[PDB]
Amino acid sequence: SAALPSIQLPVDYNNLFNEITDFLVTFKQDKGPKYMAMLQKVANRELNSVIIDLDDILQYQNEKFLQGTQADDLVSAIQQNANHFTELFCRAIDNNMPLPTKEIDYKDDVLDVILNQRRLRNERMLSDRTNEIRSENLMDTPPSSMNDALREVVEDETELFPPNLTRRYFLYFKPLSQNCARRYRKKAISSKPLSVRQIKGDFLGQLITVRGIITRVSDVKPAVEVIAYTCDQCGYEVFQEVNSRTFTPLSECTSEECSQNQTKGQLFMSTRASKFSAFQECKIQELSQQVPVGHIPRSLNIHVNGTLVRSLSPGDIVDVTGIFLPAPYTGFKALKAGLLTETYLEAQFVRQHKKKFASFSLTSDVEERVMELITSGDVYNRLAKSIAPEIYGNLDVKKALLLLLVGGVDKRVGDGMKIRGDINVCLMGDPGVAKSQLLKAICKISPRGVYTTGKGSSGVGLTAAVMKDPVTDEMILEGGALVLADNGICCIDEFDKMDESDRTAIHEVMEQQTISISKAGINTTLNARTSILAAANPLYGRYNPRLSPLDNINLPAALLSRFDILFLMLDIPSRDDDEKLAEHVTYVHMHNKQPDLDFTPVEPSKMREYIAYAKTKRPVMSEAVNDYVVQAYIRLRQDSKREMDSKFSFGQATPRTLLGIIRLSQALAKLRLADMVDIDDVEEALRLVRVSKESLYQE
Amino acid sequence: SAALPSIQLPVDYNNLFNEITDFLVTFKQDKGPKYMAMLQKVANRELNSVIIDLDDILQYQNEKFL
Amino acid sequence: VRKDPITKEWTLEGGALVLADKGVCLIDEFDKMNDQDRTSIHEAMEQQSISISKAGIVTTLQARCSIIAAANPNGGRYNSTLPLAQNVSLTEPILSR
Amino acid sequence: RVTLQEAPGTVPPGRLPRHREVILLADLVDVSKPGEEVEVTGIYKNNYDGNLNAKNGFPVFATIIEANSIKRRVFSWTEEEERE
Amino acid sequence: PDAVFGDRVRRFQEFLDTFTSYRDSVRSIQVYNSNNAANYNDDLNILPHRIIISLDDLREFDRSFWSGILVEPAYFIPPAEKALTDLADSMDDVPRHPWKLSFKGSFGAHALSPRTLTAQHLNKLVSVEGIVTKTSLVRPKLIRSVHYAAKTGRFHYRDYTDATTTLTTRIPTPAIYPTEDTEGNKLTTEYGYSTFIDHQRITVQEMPEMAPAGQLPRSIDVILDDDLVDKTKPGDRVNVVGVFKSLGAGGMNQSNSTLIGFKTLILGNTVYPLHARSTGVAARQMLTDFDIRNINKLSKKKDIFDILSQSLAPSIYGHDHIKKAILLMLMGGVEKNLENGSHLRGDINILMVGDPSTAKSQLLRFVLNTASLAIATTGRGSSGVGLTAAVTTDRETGERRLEAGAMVLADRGVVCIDEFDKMTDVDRVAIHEVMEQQTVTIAKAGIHTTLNARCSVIAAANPVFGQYDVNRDPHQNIALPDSLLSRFDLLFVVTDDINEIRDRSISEHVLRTHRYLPPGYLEGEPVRERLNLSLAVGGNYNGTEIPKLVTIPFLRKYVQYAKERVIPQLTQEAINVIVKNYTDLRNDDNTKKSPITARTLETLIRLATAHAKVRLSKTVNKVDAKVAANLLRFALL
Amino acid sequence: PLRDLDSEHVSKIVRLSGIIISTSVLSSRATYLSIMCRNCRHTTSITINNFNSITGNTVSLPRSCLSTIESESSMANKKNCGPDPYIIIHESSKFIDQQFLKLQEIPELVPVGEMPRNLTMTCDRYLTNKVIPGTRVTIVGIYSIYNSKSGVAIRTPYIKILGIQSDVETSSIWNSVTMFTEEEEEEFLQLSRNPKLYEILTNSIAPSIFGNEDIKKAIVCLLMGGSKKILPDGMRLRGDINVLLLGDPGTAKSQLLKFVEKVSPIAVYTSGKGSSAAGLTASVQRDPMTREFYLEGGAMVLADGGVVCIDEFDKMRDEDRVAIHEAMEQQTISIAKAGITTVLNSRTSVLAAANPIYGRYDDL
Ligand SMILES: Nc1ncnc2c1ncn2[C@@H]1O[C@H](COP(=O)(O)OP(=O)(O)OP(O)(O)=S)[C@@H](O)[C@H]1O
Ligand SMILES: Nc1ncnc2c1ncn2[C@@H]1O[C@H](COP(=O)(O)OP(=O)(O)OP(O)(O)=S)[C@@H](O)[C@H]1O
Ligand SMILES: Nc1ncnc2c1ncn2[C@@H]1O[C@H](COP(=O)(O)OP(=O)(O)O)[C@@H](O)[C@H]1O
Ligand SMILES: [Mg+2]
Ligand SMILES: [Mg+2]
Ligand SMILES: [Mg+2]
Ligand SMILES: [Zn+2]
Ligand SMILES: [Zn+2]
């Protein structure tokens, strides 16, 4: 009819499906084909997700071009119609599925045995129908023709479980990289990361990559795709698909046996036989450098389904590649104009800008780079100088910041009590010593780094607050900055300007690594394992030698003792050092880079993977280093007793200083990638402790 | 509106009405004009029908062309 | 100008000073008023009118009200050696009226 | 519509004062200001509400008093008051 | 086909033939699109299909057709759009979306406000100026849906229309979403082949400058389409040109049965973001070739720094080095972003402290009036939430959302802070981050963000004793934290010292300024005030066309050109000078008003870069470093 | 009075005085509307001249097509167009504006234990936008009835406004008039030729206040003001004068302030801490109906182009202090809140009075 007219499009799904089937069995990356081995792993219940890489498809098409045959542009068709090609690829995979070599047993998943029973039921239905029709023997009469016709009549007569109900895998499209597109003169919109402002309505239905920071992640919930009902009257299982935010259930049976009969059966839901998906809704926010001048950053919804859940956490700079799809309109009915649709990005691939330390694996690629960095020589000094190559000097400051990034070994004792392994570092000094720049650099280096202001972050912005999640429809506790920097370095600039509630929160966090909140909302204890780096000024804004160091440091004795290292950063005017500082800063301003060409600074990703490898080690301490540490602690306590009355006092020596020495020695042993702690590590830790305060204050 | 659209036709009913009036006033077949005496006979209740001859109109048009 | 939570309508209340127009206003514990009531009282005895600019309503209301106030001395006991100015929390402009 | 509350001098010690809704007809409007004690005679009848009360779970009815008369339990001076 | 529609199409075709500017504007748009398409084919941006139309030229051509568009746009605008589409397709024969129209020029009685809009202006083309308060999400609206039938392997489609796209109303025919075709086969939706057009609605209320001071303001809703979405943000001053339309039936149906009335909204054809004083819209202006030639001629002069500085505020006597500092701040310097994500400041902060009635607030008001994106702030009036940002709750989405404060809205601009000494401590701690790290970090309940706040700051302070005292040390006179003084690039102490000759000069200057008459004004006539609204594209009185001193509108052209065009680079001849001056200043013995830190070297670099931007020079020279050092030495001593 | 409205006044013209709380936005009603049948293509016109009803459509679109009952065509081409087949052709329809007002009784005369009562009013055409909220008006109108969906047969009353008379007219920039009659111009020029104009204008300033002649001269100079400037460089120099009067109590300073407030064309009398509920300087609050920033009030913005008489200038808040400073020299107020940033004109002459500490002025 002319009510639904037709158009001619360049796309033809038959030859594209044939190309997909040829690609899945022909592509060999340079045991046999790659995706055939992947499907063999899936069929053996060893893999749950199939990731289709568009780089492989582009390589396949280009090789087919080199042999000279004609192959359609499957990559661009996937880039423009990813929602259809998901099901096309799933059907192509289901067409040629290798048989499982492993036999099913009692240790397999419930879904696996359910799908196996469904497959066996399908074969038994086909066999029973073929046997029945062959036993009827209608014509009593070309064996191949009659076998083919019997196969078709059995296939279209029976009611089988559809392939959607027998799939144990999730299929995702990995975007093609920019490098492989650069090699072969390809211009891909999937490779280029877009901000949430630049994703317009003409990008709908496409596989696109969005770059941004994750702000909120929903809890993983079972979102049903098809509901299974059972009927006691006929024994059929009735499956109802669901593709909306809400559904209505079936009441009367819709199977053929009940539909033909006068008495209809009643359906009952079976939760185990129905099909669910792990569902998360995430909010991605525009990055600060992507927002135009004077604008507010925008947000985009991401739908995470299947095995990609729990791969997104708040505060993560991330590239999320997914299909831009429309949604039903949510809002006031009076304000809608036409067929307005909301937008979401059904996530297919997740790329982390800063790889997490817990996700580190000793693969073949990281091993050669770590070994190269080891054999380059002097890894400790080279890693220290490369934290902030822009900032001249402050070698010991950068060394202790690198130890802050690495951290010591946490201790768990069998009685249940714990001793923290994270180092806490304070940087107090006169203005103009670039401590804020160092804090920002440490935030950039660490995978989980939160930069806060002493008055910018309040009490509710540090600990927690109860809020309602509408997608899961439940009240959840949204954490603050200390929660957001869990198992990471939290940097607090302007530490001296904080109010007493934030001081109390940090006072509990630096020792206990927990926050205990007992308010009208919730009575809970939450884990905050932040390693805390603070920046601070004295009383008057400037250091004066007239007062004692304890006098001009506004810091109580307990929270002073919680800091493992405090760095006085005094701006002493000297003619010789100002020459070097001026030429360094001016070279940085002129050639837009570090002046020293005698060594190559380590890249932040290289530093991140080396620190990740160093954090895996758990060094122990022998008897000799224990005696050395004990004697050093005794001498430190005696020196603090002697200097307590004098004006050179920096506090009182504390068992926390003993723990700080042990922690710094363990971090230095970790940086050597060693399972043992030597004497020289303890000497370096004690040297750092001494040059933290006494060396610079004495001068 | 577009439910009752318009078309342009060569006929103009204003200049045609003016030509009709000029024909009724100034036509002299060869006491005074023919249709002016016919209208005087109608007005005196001596005539009940007015017969318009298209031959007279064609004569009027060809004299105007002359 | 106050909104009823249930009736969902606005009401313009003149207060005790406007409501006592051509009458008398009886203020108990005159010493311990807050700043807003003190400003209202000063405006009522100064111009005998109260000006409001709230919720789009900008107007003036007549407050020609006689005021009888009751107050306690500072510390709860009057001091005869000290004058009345330092025996109350009331300032000079509100006391002279 | 006038809310009538029990006067606090007559309430039993531990108990709360009860209240009723009194409906005033054409000539009885604006005769009783709030905060004053009145004595009202009227028909004690049953108000009708749609679908009763769902919160209680019982067929509970509300009651009103349609006032037939109101008696109260003025700065007007006469000529005798003037000469006094 | 309609006869009057065709006649109006022919009339607008004749109008477009008369004025060739619209024709070759269409041609320029088409060749730009074709060049981008060819560049994408061989090795990007696309221009929208709409043309700005001057209503004054149309009134000169055909007054009847102009009044037809203004009074009844539903019958006249679609023929004009059809004629424009036909002309564009006629020039596109050698190399698909229909062309639109945008209107500019004087509207007369149709230049209204949201308060002035009544229903007599309904179904008319109106220009409404106001302030954007609410900006809804840009949502895609489905126009054509494409579906695939796998049994037959055929692609079907359906077109959808509503009342907000077309000016003239038609019969509403609701076509449902096709999920099965005529023969009953399953249809699968082909996303990526369907057509979605971006749709937005904004709420424009009257500007508080001409809103009445007492009562509530009035607002209207404006519907914007694919090429007009994201042209505005809340807080902008706008002029929206569009048809004031009414939609639906005002409860006259039996199903509807309420008194909302007929819903009224503007089908926006044109959105102009206008620049007002202390708003979020940056003042931009068209640079002609004559102006660029004049700027280049002034760039070659050797006294140009002394000309632009003295021509800033000629009504204020003295304070010449303050004028130089303000000019170098308006130049803005150059910021550095390294490969490791580090950011280095470019902007210059100026603090002035001293005696009252020393032309401090007048200088602040001048910089507010003459800068592109200057925003005025006072001390105790603004707070921590009003300066950096605040958090509110969206009504539609139900989630928290951000309000950008004074310092965020002045990104790449100037923040003019008056009465700096009376600010609260929390404000000081908040602005410690903004003056140096150039960002605002928000860590609230559920929201952790970082907003760019790249600004220049002018502050005016007052000594705690009321008047500056010479014999007292400056630390007690200023009474400000050392960190705050380190943040500011230049600090100027102004003293109202009394001298007879100097006071005679001040009095003569003030009286000569007070003997001024505007051109075209009588002796007794009072000067009228017109509120300054400018469109954002993309003691001698007779200073006109660079005679001795640069006039203010040309000075803004010079500043804008120097900001966008030239980005100077350092060279070793200036480097030796700035290193010598900085290392000398760190080791000087004389007492200075401002303390000396490592930031002073960067102030030297920024001032040298700004002076290079004054000279329109690709590089920083030795004389630039000398000027930068000698300007800072006055502020220090 | 509003409390005396009974059921005997229903559908009768009544005159009632009161104050106005809120004026609603202008709704769009239809006077002439052209309609077209959905499929029948029948065109009809409805002209409505009764716009005074609320909560109910007294005139609506017809429930069925009118082509069949008319039998207009001799051809007459069972066919049913359906229920409600007419659509409104908006481009050929005529509309007007309609406004809802809310009028309360005078708050001066209200029982102490009672919430004051109000009525809803409907006005249309040239009666809309004639009043601002807060003004005291006398309304002539029809006391009438609407049913809003507490009594089995109960109705909500309202007022059909037929005419509005304002008892007093507030003074502002938009309410100011600049047109002058010719006889007033002749009188004003004839007054100016008097050589003793300074003496008559100083004597006319507060004739009931004995002495303080120089202060009266100051008041005259305050009332005239100076010449405002717009200089070519963009900076403006003010012409308004600021006069402070500080001294011992009981010296007619407040009386001079009140006289200046009464004699000025636009003036606001306020204290240092503002009014009872009217703030000082400029107050930006959210709209009560749309939660959006707008300028609520303040003495210096309500009296732009006029005089603010600030009694008790010494007791004052710090934000008020800095805003008053910016209003005295720059004659503008700069408000930079979280959502709105603006600089708005505050061109006002400031006349302030203060009292010295320790009671009387001390000569030492
Ligand atoms: N040793 C250094 N090397 C390089 N740059 C430096 C050095 N010391 C200071 N700077 C620069 O001086 C400026 C000081 O900025 P900040 O990092 O804010 O210093 P600061 O110590 O944080 O001052 P505060 O915030 O008052 S404690 C920055 O531009 C730094 O890059
Ligand atoms: N010279 C005068 N001529 C006439 N009336 C006067 C004179 N001096 C005072 N009064 C009256 O004395 C009373 C005192 O009130 P005001 O003097 O106006 O108050 P004020 O003292 O000026 O202001 P303060 O200091 O805030 S109480 C008023 O009724 C004045 O009218
Ligand atoms: N050097 C000067 N040249 C010209 N006018 C001046 C000068 N100094 C002060 N003024 C005048 O003094 C008045 C007071 O304002 P301003 O000086 O800006 O106050 P502040 O110095 O407290 O900011 C201004 O109107 C200004 O015209
Ligand atoms: Mg800092
Ligand atoms: Mg000033
Ligand atoms: Mg007084
Ligand atoms: Zn069944
Ligand atoms: Zn019909």
Swiss-Prot record, chain B:
Belongs to the MCM family. The gene is MCM7. Coiled coil: none annotated. The lineage of its organism: Eukaryota, Fungi, Dikarya, Ascomycota, Saccharomycotina. Present with 166 molecules/cell in log phase SD medium. Early fractionation of eukaryotic MCM proteins yielded a variety of dimeric, trimeric and tetrameric complexes with unclear biological significance. Specifically a MCM467 subcomplex is shown to have in vitro helicase activity which is inhibited by the MCM2 subunit. The MCM2-7 hexamer is the proposed physiological active complex. Component of the MCM2-7 complex. The complex forms a toroidal hexameric ring with the proposed subunit order MCM2-MCM6-MCM4-MCM7-MCM3-MCM5; loaded onto DNA, forms a head-head double hexamer. Interacts with CSM1 and MCM10. It is found in: Cytoplasm; Nucleus. This is DNA replication licensing factor MCM7. Acts as a component of the MCM2-7 complex (MCM complex) which is the putative replicative helicase essential for 'once per cell cycle' DNA replication initiation and elongation in eukaryotic cells. Core component of CDC45-MCM-GINS (CMG) helicase, the molecular machine that unwinds template DNA during replication, and around which the replisome is built.
Curated annotation (Swiss-Prot), chain C:
Acts as a component of the MCM2-7 complex (MCM complex) which is the putative replicative helicase essential for 'once per cell cycle' DNA replication initiation and elongation in eukaryotic cells. The active ATPase sites in the MCM2-7 ring are formed through the interaction surfaces of two neighboring subunits such that a critical structure of a conserved arginine finger motif is provided in trans relative to the ATP-binding site of the Walker A box of the adjacent subunit. It comes from Saccharomyces cerevisiae (strain ATCC 204508 / S288c). This is DNA replication licensing factor MCM2. It is found in: Nucleus. Belongs to the MCM family. The lineage of its organism: Eukaryota, Fungi, Dikarya, Ascomycota, Saccharomycotina. The chain holds residues 580 to 676 of 868 of the full protein. Present with 1690 molecules/cell in log phase SD medium. The gene is MCM2. Changing residue 97 to A: Loss of MCM2-7 complex helicase activity. Component of the MCM2-7 complex. The complex forms a toroidal hexameric ring with the proposed subunit order MCM2-MCM6-MCM4-MCM7-MCM3-MCM5; loaded onto DNA, forms a head-head double hexamer.
From Swiss-Prot, chain E:
Its main location: nucleus. A motif (Arginine finger) lies at residues 486-489. Present with 35100 molecules/cell in log phase SD medium. Early fractionation of eukaryotic MCM proteins yielded a variety of dimeric, trimeric and tetrameric complexes with unclear biological significance. The MCM2-7 hexamer is the proposed physiological active complex. This is DNA replication licensing factor MCM3. Changing residue 360 to A: No effect on MCM2-7 complex helicase activity. Loss of MCM2-7 complex helicase activity. Reduces MCM2-7 complex helicase activity. It comes from Saccharomyces cerevisiae (strain ATCC 204508 / S288c). It is found in: Nucleus. GO terms for molecular function: ATP binding; ATP hydrolysis activity; chromatin binding; DNA replication origin binding; helicase activity; MCM complex binding; single-stranded DNA binding. It catalyses: ATP + H2O = ADP + phosphate + H(+). GO terms for cellular component: chromosome, telomeric region; CMG complex; cytoplasm; DNA replication preinitiation complex; MCM complex; nuclear pre-replicative complex; nuclear replication fork; nucleoplasm. Component of the MCM2-7 complex. The complex forms a toroidal hexameric ring with the proposed subunit order MCM2-MCM6-MCM4-MCM7-MCM3-MCM5; loaded onto DNA, forms a head-head double hexamer. Interacts with CSM1. Belongs to the MCM family. Its EC number is 3.6.4.12.
From Swiss-Prot, chain F:
It is found in: Nucleus. Residues 197-364 form the MCM domain. ATP binds at residues 247-254. Belongs to the MCM family. Acts as a component of the MCM2-7 complex (MCM complex) which is the putative replicative helicase essential for 'once per cell cycle' DNA replication initiation and elongation in eukaryotic cells. The active ATPase sites in the MCM2-7 ring are formed through the interaction surfaces of two neighboring subunits such that a critical structure of a conserved arginine finger motif is provided in trans relative to the ATP-binding site of the Walker A box of the adjacent subunit. Present with 10300 molecules/cell in log phase SD medium. Early fractionation of eukaryotic MCM proteins yielded a variety of dimeric, trimeric and tetrameric complexes with unclear biological significance. The MCM2-7 hexamer is the proposed physiological active complex. Component of the MCM2-7 complex. The complex forms a toroidal hexameric ring with the proposed subunit order MCM2-MCM6-MCM4-MCM7-MCM3-MCM5; loaded onto DNA, forms a head-head double hexamer. Interacts with CSM1. This is Minichromosome maintenance protein 5.
